[PDB]
Design a protein around this ligand. Structure first.
Ligand SMILES: Nc1ncnc2c1ncn2[C@@H]1O[C@H](COP(=O)(O)OP(=O)(O)O)[C@@H](O)[C@H]1O
Ligand SMILES: NC(=[NH2+])NCCC[C@@H](N)C(=O)O
Ligand SMILES: [Mg+2]
Length: 356
C-alpha cells in the first residue's frame, strides 16, 4: 500500500470519526483498533482498504458503506467485514458458517392477501458471481463483455416459461430504459454508492437485462453483481414467484459456475447480499401503519424486515406504496429468509387491521 493511499485512508478515517450523526455500519465498526490492523494490507489483485471503504467515506448517508473488490477482500479485510456482516445479518459469529442451500417446502407458503386490499406486487431475487471473475472494481472492459457473452449465451438456452430475450443496455433507447425502470423491471442508472465503489466503469458496456415476454423472469447482467436472478408479478402470490425463482436458479446453476464459500455461502459484491443472496419483497400499502415511514420502519425492524421506497432503496414511497422485504440473507436458509418476509408481512397486515 503506497503512501498516497495511506494518507487518503487516514484522512477518510478522520472524516468518519467527525461525522457525529453518521449512522453507517462502516462508521460504527471501523474503530481505531480495527483500522490500524488492516490498513496496510493488500489483496492479490491489488485491492486495498480504500477500495473497501471508499464508497462509505464519500457517501456518509450510507447504511453499510463497504464493498468487496474481490473475493479475497472478505478475509484480507476480515476484521472489518466480519463485524459489519454480523451486525447487518442479525447474528453471525466467527465460528458460524452459512447453512447449505435449501429452498424448503414451497407448498408450506400461504396466501398473503386473498382480498387484494394490501399487496400490489411480489418479487424475489437472488445474486450470483461467476467463478474466475472479480467484482466490479477489478474488471476490465474486455472482462465485462466476456461475462455478458457467457451469461447471455447461457440464458438463450432457457426453456418454456423462462425462455426469453437478452436486451443490452447499450443500444436501448432512453425512452425504453426509463419505461423498464419505471415499471420496476430494470436496474436504475447512476447509483452514487456504486459509482464511488468504482462499480460502474465503462457503463453501460457489458450491462443489460434478460427477460421473458411476460417479464415475470428477469436477469440483470453486470450491474451491482454479475447476475441478479429475479421473479416477480402483480398481486400477492409469493408461492408462485418463489417456485419460479427456484426453477430458474437451479437451471442456471447447472450451466454456469458460481462462486460459493464454505462460510459466506454465495459471494456478492456487497456483504449485505451474502449467503442466500435472497431478497423477497412486496409492494404494499399499509395506510394506518405508514402515516409516518419512521414508525413503519420501526415496526418492520422488529420483524427483521427492511423498508424501501417504491423505486427501490434510497427512494421515497409513492402513493402510499412501500417496498418491504427480509433484511437478513446470511446465516439462514433460503426458505427461512422467504418465510421471514412472509411471516412479518402477515403480522404487519394483522396489525394494520387492528390499528385505529
Ligand atoms: N416487491 C416488488 N414489487 C415490484 N417491484 C419491486 C419489488 N421489489 C423491488 N422492486 C423494484 O426493483 C428495482 C430494484 O430496486 P432495489 O431496491 O435496488 O432491489 P435489489 O434487491 O433488486 O437490488 C426497483 O425499481 C424496485 O421498484
Ligand atoms: N448492496 C446494496 N445494493 N445495498 C446495501 C447498502 C449499500 C451501501 N452502499 C449503503 O450503505 O447504502
Ligand atoms: Mg439494487
Amino acid at each position: 500500500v503506497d503512501q498516497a493511499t495511506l494518507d487518503k485512508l487516514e484522512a477518510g478515517f478522520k472524516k468518519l470519526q467527525e461525522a457525529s450523526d453518521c449512522k453507517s455500519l462502516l462508521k460504527k465498526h471501523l474503530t481505531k483498533d480495527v483500522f490500524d490492523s488492516i490498513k496496510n494490507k493488500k489483496t492479490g489483485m491489488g485491492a486495498t482498504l480504500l477500495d473497501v471503504i471508499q464508497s462509505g467515506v464519500e457517501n456518509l448517508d450510507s447504511g453499510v458503506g463497504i464493498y468487496a473488490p474481490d473475493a479475497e477482500s472478505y478475509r484480507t479485510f476480515g476484521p472489518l467485514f466480519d463485524p459489519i456482516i454480523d451486525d447487518y445479518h442479525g447474528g453471525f459469529k466467527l465460528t458460524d458458517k452459512h447453512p447449505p442451500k435449501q429452498w424448503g417446502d414451497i407448498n408450506t407458503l400461504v396466501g398473503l392477501d386473498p382480498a387484494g386490499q394490501f399487496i400490489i406486487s411480489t418479487r424475489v431475487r437472488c445474486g450470483r458471481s461467476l467463478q474466475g471473475y472479480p467484482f466490479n472494481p477489478c474488471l476490465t472492459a474486455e472482462q465485462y463483455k466476456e461475462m455478458e457473452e457467457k451469461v447471455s449465451s447461457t440464458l438463450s438456452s432457457m426453456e418454456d416459461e423462462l425462455k426469453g430475450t437478452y436486451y443490452p443496455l447499450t443500444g436501448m433507447s432512453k425512452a425504453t430504459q426509463q419505461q423498464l425502470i419505471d415499471d420496476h423491471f430494470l436496474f436504475k442508472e447512476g447509483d452514487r454508492f456504486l459509482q464511488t465503489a468504482n462499480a460502474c466503469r465503462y457503463w453501460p458496456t457489458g450491462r443489460g437485462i434478460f427477460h421473458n415476454d411476460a417479464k415475470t423472469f428477469l436477469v440483470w447482467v453486470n450491474e451491482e453483481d454479475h447476475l441478479r436472478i429475479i421473479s416477480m408479478q402483480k398481486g400477492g402470490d409469493l408461492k408462485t414467484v418463489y417456485k419460479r425463482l427456484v426453477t430458474a436458479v437451479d437451471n442456471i446453476e447447472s450451466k454456469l459456475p458460481f462462486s460459493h464459500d464454505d462460510r459466506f455461502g454465495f459471494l456478492t459484491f456487497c456483504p449485505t447480499n451474502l449467503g442466500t443472496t435472497m431478497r423477497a419483497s412486496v409492494h404494499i400499502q399499509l395506510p394506518k401503519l405508514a402515516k409516518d415511514r419512521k414508525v413503519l420502519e420501526d415496526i418492520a425492524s422488529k420483524f427483521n424486515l427492511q423498508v424501501r421506497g417504491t423505486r427501490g432503496e434510497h427512494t421515497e414511497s409513492e402513493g402510499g406504496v412501500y417496498d418491504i422485504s427480509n433484511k437478513r440473507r446470511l446465516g439462514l436458509t433460503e426458505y427461512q429468509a422467504v418465510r421471514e418476509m412472509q411471516d412479518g408481512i402477515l403480522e404487519m397486515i394483522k396489525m394494520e387491521k387492528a390499528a385505529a
